[PDB]
Amino acid sequence: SKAQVLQSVAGQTLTVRCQYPPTGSLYEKKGWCKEASALVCIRLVTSSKPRTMAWTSRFTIWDDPDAGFFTVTMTDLREEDSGHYWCRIYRPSDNSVSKSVRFYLVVS
Amino acid sequence: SKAQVLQSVAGQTLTVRCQYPPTGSLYEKKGWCKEASALVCIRLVTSSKPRTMAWTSRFTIWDDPDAGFFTVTMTDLREEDSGHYWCRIYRPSDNSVSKSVRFYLVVS
């Protein structure tokens, strides 16, 4: 789909916000992954529970359903981080994707 | 000078890191401003003391000399935020600029 272009420079920190509608008492895992192929997106970080300090190296997610969005943070950008990414939201019931946004990160 | 290009989309949050060398026990105010002309840069936010929650609406700065850099955060980007900006570092002694980095923010 038409990737939204994000651009920064090496050493900086990237912040990406992805909003989503309410699903009641049910919790949807949030994920950030990098496209490796048209049909492979490698998971970089995932929020499994709400308002958790979801770590994993340079990548983190802070998700709060009460706010209606989660924020992905990528620190210490390198040229090699350039590429296509998606923030994805997964359903409990079957891990199907209910919302996904494609981004093109350009780091120079 | 050759502005570094930062690019995002409306609604997102922008993070800008500016590093700087040590000045001992002396504290340099940190500022973020937007170019209005070649010789006018309007101050948007300033850190007057170290590790302070330097507010002022959508813009904030967190500066920590022990870390060697400060971070400017601009939330809720709008198309109108597009333009040239500088993160500046001011000397005690006379408010002269000891370091400044020019950026071009593109928000679509």
GROMACS .gro file of C-alpha atoms in nm:
model
  216
    1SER     CA    1   0.000   0.000   0.000
    2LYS     CA    2   0.113   0.362  -0.010
    3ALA     CA    3   0.385   0.367   0.253
    4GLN     CA    4   0.410   0.683   0.455
    5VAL     CA    5   0.768   0.816   0.440
    6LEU     CA    6   0.955   0.871   0.763
    7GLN     CA    7   1.300   1.029   0.738
    8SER     CA    8   1.575   1.098   0.989
    9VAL     CA    9   1.954   1.083   1.028
   10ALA     CA   10   2.189   0.838   1.189
   11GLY     CA   11   2.211   0.859   1.565
   12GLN     CA   12   1.860   1.001   1.598
   13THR     CA   13   1.563   0.839   1.764
   14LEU     CA   14   1.246   0.759   1.575
   15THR     CA   15   0.896   0.773   1.726
   16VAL     CA   16   0.595   0.621   1.543
   17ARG     CA   17   0.237   0.653   1.667
   18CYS     CA   18  -0.040   0.414   1.543
   19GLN     CA   19  -0.391   0.478   1.663
   20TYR     CA   20  -0.681   0.226   1.675
   21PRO     CA   21  -1.051   0.199   1.774
   22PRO     CA   22  -1.176   0.043   2.107
   23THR     CA   23  -1.227  -0.333   2.155
   24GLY     CA   24  -1.371  -0.332   2.507
   25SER     CA   25  -1.212  -0.556   2.768
   26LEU     CA   26  -1.028  -0.749   2.494
   27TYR     CA   27  -0.653  -0.685   2.438
   28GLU     CA   28  -0.490  -0.677   2.098
   29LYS     CA   29  -0.116  -0.734   2.085
   30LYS     CA   30   0.069  -0.449   1.904
   31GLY     CA   31   0.374  -0.518   1.689
   32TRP     CA   32   0.634  -0.338   1.477
   33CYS     CA   33   0.809  -0.533   1.203
   34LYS     CA   34   1.034  -0.474   0.907
   35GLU     CA   35   0.948  -0.601   0.557
   36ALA     CA   36   1.193  -0.864   0.436
   37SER     CA   37   0.976  -0.959   0.133
   38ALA     CA   38   0.620  -0.889   0.007
   39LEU     CA   39   0.505  -1.161   0.225
   40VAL     CA   40   0.751  -1.158   0.522
   41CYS     CA   41   0.760  -0.892   0.793
   42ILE     CA   42   1.012  -0.974   1.067
   43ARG     CA   43   0.889  -0.888   1.420
   44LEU     CA   44   1.113  -0.638   1.593
   45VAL     CA   45   0.914  -0.566   1.907
   46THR     CA   46   0.567  -0.656   2.047
   47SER     CA   47   0.344  -0.521   2.326
   48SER     CA   48   0.172  -0.827   2.480
   49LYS     CA   49  -0.002  -0.650   2.769
   50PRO     CA   50  -0.127  -0.291   2.808
   51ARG     CA   51   0.095  -0.014   2.949
   52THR     CA   52   0.399  -0.242   2.968
   53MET     CA   53   0.762  -0.136   2.922
   54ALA     CA   54   0.791  -0.361   2.613
   55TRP     CA   55   1.173  -0.365   2.564
   56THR     CA   56   1.400  -0.564   2.317
   57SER     CA   57   1.714  -0.361   2.245
   58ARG     CA   58   1.689  -0.044   2.046
   59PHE     CA   59   1.312  -0.094   1.994
   60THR     CA   60   1.027  -0.041   2.236
   61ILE     CA   61   0.652   0.010   2.237
   62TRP     CA   62   0.437   0.185   2.485
   63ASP     CA   63   0.070   0.096   2.434
   64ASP     CA   64  -0.219   0.233   2.625
   65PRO     CA   65  -0.577   0.138   2.513
   66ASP     CA   66  -0.724   0.416   2.725
   67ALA     CA   67  -0.535   0.657   2.501
   68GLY     CA   68  -0.629   0.485   2.175
   69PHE     CA   69  -0.278   0.442   2.028
   70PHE     CA   70   0.060   0.288   2.083
   71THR     CA   71   0.399   0.443   2.016
   72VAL     CA   72   0.698   0.262   1.874
   73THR     CA   73   1.047   0.408   1.957
   74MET     CA   74   1.360   0.308   1.758
   75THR     CA   75   1.679   0.454   1.907
   76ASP     CA   76   2.018   0.506   1.761
   77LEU     CA   77   1.910   0.490   1.396
   78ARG     CA   78   2.164   0.350   1.148
   79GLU     CA   79   2.157   0.366   0.768
   80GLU     CA   80   2.071  -0.007   0.764
   81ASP     CA   81   1.746   0.058   0.942
   82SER     CA   82   1.619   0.213   0.621
   83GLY     CA   83   1.338   0.017   0.467
   84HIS     CA   84   0.965  -0.067   0.486
   85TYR     CA   85   0.799  -0.127   0.821
   86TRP     CA   86   0.447  -0.189   0.950
   87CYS     CA   87   0.294  -0.127   1.284
   88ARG     CA   88   0.040  -0.416   1.325
   89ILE     CA   89  -0.249  -0.486   1.566
   90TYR     CA   90  -0.342  -0.856   1.622
   91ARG     CA   91  -0.680  -1.004   1.728
   92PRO     CA   92  -0.701  -1.231   2.035
   93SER     CA   93  -0.921  -1.478   1.879
   94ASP     CA   94  -0.691  -1.577   1.598
   95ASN     CA   95  -0.388  -1.347   1.566
   96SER     CA   96  -0.536  -1.197   1.250
   97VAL     CA   97  -0.446  -0.839   1.170
   98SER     CA   98  -0.719  -0.587   1.236
   99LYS     CA   99  -0.518  -0.281   1.141
  100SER     CA  100  -0.179  -0.223   0.990
  101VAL     CA  101   0.004   0.084   0.857
  102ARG     CA  102   0.299   0.063   0.619
  103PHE     CA  103   0.590   0.309   0.652
  104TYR     CA  104   0.907   0.371   0.455
  105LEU     CA  105   1.198   0.473   0.687
  106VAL     CA  106   1.478   0.662   0.528
  107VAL     CA  107   1.783   0.705   0.746
  108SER     CA  108   2.078   0.900   0.608
  109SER     CA  109   2.412   2.555   0.609
  110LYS     CA  110   2.314   2.213   0.478
  111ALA     CA  111   1.995   2.144   0.670
  112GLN     CA  112   1.939   1.786   0.769
  113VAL     CA  113   1.595   1.672   0.646
  114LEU     CA  114   1.348   1.536   0.897
  115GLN     CA  115   1.020   1.401   0.761
  116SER     CA  116   0.702   1.274   0.923
  117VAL     CA  117   0.322   1.289   0.887
  118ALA     CA  118   0.053   1.488   1.058
  119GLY     CA  119  -0.044   1.366   1.401
  120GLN     CA  120   0.297   1.210   1.465
  121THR     CA  121   0.549   1.312   1.725
  122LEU     CA  122   0.896   1.432   1.633
  123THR     CA  123   1.208   1.367   1.842
  124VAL     CA  124   1.535   1.555   1.772
  125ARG     CA  125   1.862   1.480   1.952
  126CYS     CA  126   2.151   1.736   1.956
  127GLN     CA  127   2.473   1.632   2.123
  128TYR     CA  128   2.747   1.863   2.262
  129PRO     CA  129   3.089   1.852   2.437
  130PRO     CA  130   3.139   1.908   2.817
  131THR     CA  131   3.169   2.255   2.975
  132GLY     CA  132   3.239   2.154   3.335
  133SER     CA  133   3.024   2.302   3.610
  134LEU     CA  134   2.894   2.568   3.367
  135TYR     CA  135   2.540   2.533   3.221
  136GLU     CA  136   2.449   2.622   2.866
  137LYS     CA  137   2.084   2.691   2.794
  138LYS     CA  138   1.947   2.471   2.509
  139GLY     CA  139   1.691   2.604   2.263
  140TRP     CA  140   1.484   2.497   1.963
  141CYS     CA  141   1.362   2.763   1.723
  142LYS     CA  142   1.204   2.794   1.382
  143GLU     CA  143   1.355   3.008   1.105
  144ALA     CA  144   1.132   3.301   1.013
  145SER     CA  145   1.403   3.469   0.798
  146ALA     CA  146   1.778   3.426   0.732
  147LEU     CA  147   1.840   3.625   1.035
  148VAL     CA  148   1.539   3.549   1.263
  149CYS     CA  149   1.483   3.219   1.444
  150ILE     CA  150   1.179   3.231   1.674
  151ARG     CA  151   1.230   3.048   2.006
  152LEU     CA  152   0.983   2.767   2.056
  153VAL     CA  153   1.116   2.607   2.372
  154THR     CA  154   1.425   2.645   2.599
  155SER     CA  155   1.591   2.434   2.870
  156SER     CA  156   1.720   2.681   3.133
  157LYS     CA  157   1.837   2.427   3.392
  158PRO     CA  158   1.961   2.068   3.355
  159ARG     CA  159   1.723   1.769   3.369
  160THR     CA  160   1.416   1.993   3.387
  161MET     CA  161   1.072   1.913   3.241
  162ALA     CA  162   1.100   2.214   3.006
  163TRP     CA  163   0.736   2.242   2.883
  164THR     CA  164   0.558   2.507   2.659
  165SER     CA  165   0.271   2.341   2.473
  166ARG     CA  166   0.345   2.088   2.205
  167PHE     CA  167   0.723   2.140   2.245
  168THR     CA  168   0.954   2.015   2.516
  169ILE     CA  169   1.322   1.955   2.580
  170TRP     CA  170   1.487   1.713   2.808
  171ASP     CA  171   1.854   1.803   2.859
  172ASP     CA  172   2.103   1.611   3.060
  173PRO     CA  173   2.474   1.722   3.053
  174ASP     CA  174   2.583   1.393   3.206
  175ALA     CA  175   2.449   1.228   2.892
  176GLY     CA  176   2.603   1.480   2.650
  177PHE     CA  177   2.287   1.570   2.453
  178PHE     CA  178   1.941   1.713   2.478
  179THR     CA  179   1.627   1.592   2.305
  180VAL     CA  180   1.358   1.813   2.160
  181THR     CA  181   1.004   1.660   2.128
  182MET     CA  182   0.735   1.819   1.905
  183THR     CA  183   0.397   1.647   1.941
  184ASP     CA  184   0.095   1.647   1.720
  185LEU     CA  185   0.274   1.758   1.403
  186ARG     CA  186   0.072   1.967   1.157
  187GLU     CA  187   0.156   2.055   0.796
  188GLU     CA  188   0.230   2.412   0.911
  189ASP     CA  189   0.515   2.292   1.127
  190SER     CA  190   0.708   2.228   0.808
  191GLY     CA  191   1.009   2.449   0.773
  192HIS     CA  192   1.367   2.515   0.889
  193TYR     CA  193   1.461   2.477   1.254
  194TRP     CA  194   1.777   2.491   1.464
  195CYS     CA  195   1.861   2.336   1.793
  196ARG     CA  196   2.094   2.596   1.960
  197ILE     CA  197   2.326   2.590   2.265
  198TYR     CA  198   2.395   2.928   2.437
  199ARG     CA  199   2.700   3.032   2.645
  200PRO     CA  200   2.652   3.166   3.000
  201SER     CA  201   2.892   3.440   2.965
  202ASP     CA  202   2.722   3.618   2.681
  203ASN     CA  203   2.438   3.414   2.527
  204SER     CA  204   2.650   3.351   2.219
  205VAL     CA  205   2.589   3.031   2.028
  206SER     CA  206   2.850   2.763   2.076
  207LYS     CA  207   2.681   2.500   1.863
  208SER     CA  208   2.382   2.496   1.637
  209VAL     CA  209   2.238   2.241   1.391
  210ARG     CA  210   1.996   2.335   1.114
  211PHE     CA  211   1.712   2.098   1.019
  212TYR     CA  212   1.443   2.100   0.753
  213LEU     CA  213   1.114   1.947   0.885
  214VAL     CA  214   0.878   1.817   0.627
  215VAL     CA  215   0.536   1.724   0.759
  216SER     CA  216   0.281   1.583   0.516
   0.00000   0.00000   0.00000
